[PDB]
């Protein structure tokens, strides 16, 4: 990871304005609306037949929280994303069997949600920093696969 | 393959962009060059400074074709053919980048269209941009 | 898009596979699971050890599907009708993967058909496998 | 995804039976045949209008050689490829303006060549190792871009 003091600060100050539970569910849902094949991992979640069925699925919103929650504690360890997501990486591989490509997809969905919520504030230079972040996390969650 | 609902969402979200096409076109490019450095290797002859006349100028042209792809969304392959020939025989831009610019376009539209950039529209806009890209690389080999 | 030449290079190369289909098939897979471990996340139910009975069988299916695709290269879409639905609506493999299997398919064919693997023929197999990889994913969304 | 001792001492042994000159020219060659657009960086190489014209093209053969040369010299810094190519990455980015994907594609063509030459000798286990190699080389070469 290569974040300069500047983009590090930017990434924290904007995330201090962020509602983690409302966005975790905003991002997990869009991820399942835009790239439908991802529902492959959520058969037990119920009805996912329409955009509103997905966005409003209580199980989807309940999960997006623990997801962006972990991703949120990860931002306090931007110098150690590898070990931070060490245990989560092992689980998504050995037990959940989740193609890592998906973490890459959630990362872009998130970025789209950040820009959407903060509007103009999510300037070009701010996006650049975040892209680095999601790339970092996605790669730390993929690290332990074998 | 876009659907009736897709085309509705697209014409809807893009139609709103209206006279800000050029401007938004330049922003996506500025977002892409900063977020994905490697993409600048295709513009060695460009002044990439914030608001360069080149970027602003290339921004309009981009958005203009998209604005045009929208008007013939049921015949894009023919509406973008001159542009597709271009990217295949001259610029020869590697395919992997289109997805990069497409993301930045979504991101740009997300910042400007807070009311219309709904999950549904977002999804549809992703299929549109992906559909356009596929057309621009349709004659690569 | 496949030219009359690409089709000719294909029928020729693959037709030279004969009964080695199930064999090269299993092989293309084994290669893919070793080179690209993440592809193993779609077979938690398969034995992925060398000589696995499931890999062999699966190896054969994948092969016969290609044979069929070749025999109907002119109109692959309808030829792979069911198969696309399968991956689109059930298997749901991320499109990123198809490129891996394909590459492994080329490597495999190269190390098994040295003669006919000329640059041209190589170039034709590539476009081919991508054409297939596109049909299979055409109905994803 | 670093190489295991057994993989390093496998890459070596196989490479020792490689004709860098021919394979470099065969690899860069096929690269301009299978992915036409990569010919954008070689407008002055002359005739490339066909598969035989490019494969038999002297300037292509030559460059294919030089290129694999640097690569070949690389298989010795397998623990710091990132450091070996810092000046070449810094270079391919600043002056030549080459999109790093090409490093990925070439590597792709390379694996097919190495397979084409050794045949049954080019084992799935060996391919895997080389994939790592090629993948590694691609990364370092891109690392210094900005
Ligand atoms: C920012 C990236 C992500 C983070 C931080 C993350 C985090 C988590 C956490 C903390 C758990 C629960 C641990 C447990 O059940 O013991 C989990 C489970 C899971 N994750 Fe991820 N994940 C991420 C992305 C994804 C993506 C994009 C998918 C799928 C497309 C996915 C699919 C799953 C599934 C299937 C479960 C199991 C849920 C259940 O049934 O309880 N995750 N993830
Ligand atoms: C939304 C997808 C894209 C569209 C609609 C598109 C459209 C265009 C248009 C209309 C032009 C102007 C051509 C003319 O003046 O007739 C152009 C030029 C160009 N495009 Fe594309 N393009 C797309 C994606 C890409 C990507 C991904 C890259 C780079 C990573 C790229 C690189 C270029 C370059 C280098 C030029 C030359 C511009 C100049 O020299 O001023 N294009 N494109
Ligand atoms: C070259 C493109 C591909 C072809 C030609 C292909 C072909 C097939 C065929 C013929 C079947 C048999 C369905 C039946 O029994 O009726 C199948 C099953 C399957 N495919 Fe695909 N496939 C392709 C790529 C992929 C990729 C990229 C992956 C994974 C990385 C994948 C994962 C699966 C899985 C897991 C099954 C289920 C097998 C089972 O349950 O036993 N496929 N595919
Ligand atoms: C295996 C990875 C590669 C390595 C290690 C590499 C190495 C080299 C080396 C040693 C040079 C000489 C630099 C100098 O003059 O000091 C060079 C030049 C160059 N490379 Fe790369 N390269 C690689 C892949 C590629 C690829 C795939 C392309 C794109 C098709 C490319 C395009 C160029 C161009 C156009 C030049 C300059 C040509 C000239 O001066 O006539 N390289 N490369
Ligand atoms: C760490 C690797 C995680 C897996 C991603 C797939 C790995 C390989 C590809 O990036 C390239 N070797 C070739 O892809 P291709 O040549 O098929 O485009």
């Amino acid at each position: 990871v290569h974040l300069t003091p500047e983009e590090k600060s930017a990434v924290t100050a904007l995330w201090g304005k962020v509602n983690v539970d409302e966005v975790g569910g905003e991002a997990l849902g869009r991820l399942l609306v835009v790239y439908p094949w991802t529902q492959r991992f959520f058969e037990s979640f119920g009805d996912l037949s329409t955009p509103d069925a997905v966005m409003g699925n209580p199980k989807v919103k309940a999960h997006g929280k623990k997801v962006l929650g972990a991703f949120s504690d990860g931002l306090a360890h931007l110098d150690n994303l590898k070990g931070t997501f060490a245990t989560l990486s092992e689980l998504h591989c050995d037990k959940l069997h989740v193609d890592p490509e998906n973490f890459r997809l959630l990362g872009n969905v998130l970025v789209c949600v950040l820009a959407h919520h903060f509007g103009k504030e999510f300037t070009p230079p701010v996006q650049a920093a975040y892209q680095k972040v999601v790339a970092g996390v996605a790669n730390a969650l993929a690290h332990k696969y074998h | 393959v876009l659907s009736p609902a897709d085309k509705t969402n697209v014409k809807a979200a893009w139609g709103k962009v209206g006279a800000h096409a050029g401007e938004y076109g330049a922003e996506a490019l500025e977002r892409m060059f900063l977020s994905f450095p490697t993409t600048k290797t295709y513009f060695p002859h460009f002044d990439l400074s914030h608001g360069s006349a080149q970027v602003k100028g290339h921004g309009k042209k981009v958005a203009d074709a998209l604005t045009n792809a929208v008007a013939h969304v049921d015949d894009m392959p023919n509406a973008l053919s001159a542009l597709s020939d271009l990217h295949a025989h001259k610029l020869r831009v590697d395919p992997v980048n289109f997805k990069l610019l497409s993301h930045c376009l979504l991101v740009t539209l997300a910042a400007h269209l807070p009311a219309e950039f709904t999950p549904a529209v977002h999804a549809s806009l992703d299929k549109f941009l992906a559909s356009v890209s596929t057309v621009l690389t349709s004659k690569y080999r």
Side-chain angles (χ1 to χ4, degrees), chain A residues 22-65:
Chain A
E22 197 182 14
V23 173
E26 180 62 28
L28 184 49
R30 281 180 180 263
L31 172 58
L32 276 64
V33 177
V34 174
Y35 310 125
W37 58 81
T38 56
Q39 301 165 198
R40 72 187 308 277
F41 308 104
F42 314 85
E43 322 186 303
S44 62
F45 279 24
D47 180 10
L48 294 173
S49 55
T50 70
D52 290 309
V54 172
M55 300 309 271
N57 192 298
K59 294 191 175 175
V60 156
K61 292 162 62 57
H63 195 56
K65 302 200 321 308

Side-chain angles (χ1 to χ4, degrees), chain A:
Chain A
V1 176
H2 196 181
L3 257 83
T4 62
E6 241 182 304
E7 278 168 345
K8 256 186 174 63
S9 311
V11 158
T12 296
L14 183 120
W15 190 265
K17 303 191 168 81
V18 183
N19 190 306
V20 188
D21 319 58
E22 197 182 14
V23 173
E26 180 62 28
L28 184 49
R30 281 180 180 263
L31 172 58
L32 276 64
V33 177
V34 174
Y35 310 125
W37 58 81
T38 56
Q39 301 165 198
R40 72 187 308 277
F41 308 104
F42 314 85
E43 322 186 303
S44 62
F45 279 24
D47 180 10
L48 294 173
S49 55
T50 70
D52 290 309
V54 172
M55 300 309 271
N57 192 298
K59 294 191 175 175
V60 156
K61 292 162 62 57
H63 195 56
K65 302 200 321 308
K66 66 175 61 176
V67 169
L68 196 55
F71 176 97
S72 187
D73 306 309
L75 275 53
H77 306 300
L78 293 165
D79 285 346
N80 318 60
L81 305 190
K82 290 294 190 301
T84 285
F85 300 100
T87 314
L88 271 175
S89 178
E90 305 183 53
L91 187 75
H92 282 72
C93 182
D94 302 333
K95 317 294 180 182
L96 309 169
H97 306 147
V98 178
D99 182 1
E101 175 48 34
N102 291 111
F103 313 131
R104 308 283 174 59
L105 287 182
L106 184 70
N108 285 44
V109 165
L110 192 65
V111 176
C112 285
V113 170
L114 291 181
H116 179 219
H117 178 68
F118 291 84
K120 182 187 178 185
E121 189 178 12
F122 190 67
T123 66
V126 162
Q127 171 183 189
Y130 262 99
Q131 291 290 345
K132 292 181 181 179
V133 198
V134 289
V137 182
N139 294 314
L141 291 176
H143 196 242
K144 306 293 172 297
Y145 282 35
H146 62 77

